[PDB]
């Protein structure tokens, strides 16, 4: 069984869903954590300085 | 004449001698069985508390905080580093234990602001400090001429920004001349070389 096309057929698991807090399809329904805004992980909003160039 | 307070002071100059030695030996047994932050009704060192700003008034709180003794509890480097940035054992943190204690206290009492703190001893594995906190929202304090300054907005979370006396000493702001070139007006503005 190849890692490519043949293995893509088994993909029918729902994980990332629309997030109640930010509206992005990043709420991981299994972990119950939003990979975009961090809902379910932190009260504060997920944010990082590396999300932009250093001097901007 | 000598104040009654001067006696508490003089006793605390040598915590390992006299009656104080026995008091500490007794007390610590109880303290060791207490939590990280225990609110106390009266300061253990009255003279020191009053000297630091304490008042037997509404909105004044005193709490004893215990912190593990010694150096930094640091995790060794995952990725590659030069020998200089490889050390793990002898590296100590830049903030003293008293400062760690003040912050733990203020976090326990979110609505209160750290006024000052002092040491109340230690054993072989931990240190104890009593922190004086103030309620900036209580009128008994908003009306106090000696304490109402702590009610100002810019005094919010003062301990977390190093505005406490222990904060200022730890930041090397004691000296007004030689030696304070990289500390005043802030460590950050001097490129963090202090």
């Amino acid at each position: 069984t190849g890692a490519g096309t043949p293995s893509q057929g088994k993909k029918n698991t729902t994980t990332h869903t629309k997030c109640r807090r930010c509206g992005e399809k990043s709420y991981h329904t299994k972990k119950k954590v939003c990979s975009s805004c961090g809902f379910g992980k932190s009260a504060k909003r997920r944010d990082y300085e590396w999300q932009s160039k250093a001097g901007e | 004449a000598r104040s009654a307070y001067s006696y508490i002071r003089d006793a605390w100059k040598n915590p390992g001698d006299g009656q104080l030695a026995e008091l500490q030996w007794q007390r610590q047994q109880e303290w060791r069985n207490e939590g990280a932050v225990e609110r106390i009704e009266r300061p253990t060192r009255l003279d020191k508390a009053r000297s630091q700003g304490y008042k037997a008034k509404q909105g004044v709180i005193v709490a004893r905080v215990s912190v593990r003794k010694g150096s930094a509890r640091k995790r060794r480097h995952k990725a590659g580093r030069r020998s200089k940035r490889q050390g793990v054992t002898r590296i100590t943190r830049r903030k003293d234990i008293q400062r760690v204690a003040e912050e733990r206290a203020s976090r326990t009492f979110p609505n209160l602001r750290v006024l000052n703190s002092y040491s109340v001893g230690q054993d072989g594995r931990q240190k104890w400090h009593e922190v004086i906190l103030i309620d900036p929202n209580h009128p008994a304090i908003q009306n106090d001429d000696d304490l109402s300054w702590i009610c100002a907005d810019d005094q919010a979370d003062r301990v977390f920004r190093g505005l406490t006396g222990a904060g200022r000493r730890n930041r090397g702001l004691s000296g007004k001349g030689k030696g304070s070139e990289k500390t005043r007006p802030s460590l950050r503005s001097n490129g963090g070389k202090g």
């Binding site: - | 030069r82 020998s83 200089k84 940035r85 490889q86 050390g87 002898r90 590296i91």
Partner: protein, 92 residues
């Protein structure tokens, strides 16, 4: 090679020939208080210590004479350029 313990030669202090006594220079003990010593203590810590992590080199197959020429009259000594000598024994 051999060499006379005492012999007449020029003394730069008296500014005239006088009998001198030759002696091999004995190493003087260190005080451990020179600037270099303090730099070693200051700059040494965790990890590599730069120059202070280096260990002393080797030896040359033969060393140059290391001697003191002490004047027999004024008692003052003077140094001279040394010469490679596999061995140096004094006569008397």
């Amino acid at each position: 090679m051999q060499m006379p313990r005492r012999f007449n030669t020029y003394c730069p202090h008296c500014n005239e020939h006088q009998e001198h006594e030759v002696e091999k220079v004995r190493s003087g003990r260190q005080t451990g208080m020179k600037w270099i010593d303090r730099q070693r203590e200051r700059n040494s810590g965790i990890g590599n210590d730069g120059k202070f992590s280096k260990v002393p080199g080797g030896d040359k197959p033969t060393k140059k004479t290391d001697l003191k020429y002490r004047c027999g009259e004024c008692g003052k000594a003077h140094l001279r350029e040394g010469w490679r000598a596999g061995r140096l024994e004094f006569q008397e």
